[PDB]
């Protein structure tokens, strides 16, 4: 059926101010029915998969789902973001382990940052 | 002592950074040898991770007679690096099985990210 605002939050599982959020950014389109549930869960989805409200935007405009070519260079641009994150932040890792590591063991820390 | 120019030559870091670093007070119109140390130290700190102010906390230790306080600036940011790659790698893990079915999908069947995103 059609829905309030509260019961579309309950259907989608949502803060009234997360609606309200998708609202102001334009991330939608009175009353409300399952098209807009299920625009709320794709928004939701993507978010948590790390795509920008900007690239959920982009993402949307495929949402007739007839544009895989289009929708996997999205996601594979994604991945390569996140890899190239998470090499740095590997980096980061190996490099305060080593430094913990030497200061447990005696300041070595300021002494490598110097 | 040294010129704006050599200072960030000595530093092996952009004019840019060094203005940017004198802006938020990182810092000690000459420049020396303490103020070279100074911004390797920040630019160190800053690409392992540590945010302005969590160097600054660092700075406070310069003078390195507070291992125990050192440690744990580094061994709380360790602990913030490695949720960071836990989180990227849920992502990295659903994002990777999403594209191979994308590349995968057979013959006219609706694309599977979006079917994902929407079930
Ligand atoms: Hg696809
Ligand atoms: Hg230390």
Redesign the interface.
């Known amino acids: 059926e059609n829905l309030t605002i509260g019961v579309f939050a309950k259907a989608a599982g949502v803060n009234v101010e997360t609606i309200r959020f998708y609202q102001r950014k334009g991330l939608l389109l009175r009353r409300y029915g399952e098209a807009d549930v299920?625009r709320v869960?794709?928004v939701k989805?993507?978010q948590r998969?790390?795509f920008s409200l900007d690239e959920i935007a982009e993402?949307l405009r495929?949402?007739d789902?007839?544009?895989?070519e289009e929708?996997?260079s999205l996601?594979?641009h994604?991945?390569k973001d996140?890899?190239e994150?998470?090499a740095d932040?590997?980096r980061?890792?190996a490099?305060?382990?080593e430094?913990?590591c030497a200061?447990?063991a005696?300041?070595?820390?300021?002494?490598?940052?110097?």
């Open positions: 299920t869960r794709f989805s993507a998969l790390g993402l495929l949402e789902g007839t544009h895989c929708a996997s996601a594979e994604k991945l996140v890899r994150k998470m932040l590997a980061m890792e490099v305060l382990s430094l913990v200061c447990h005696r300041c070595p820390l300021i002494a490598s940052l110097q």
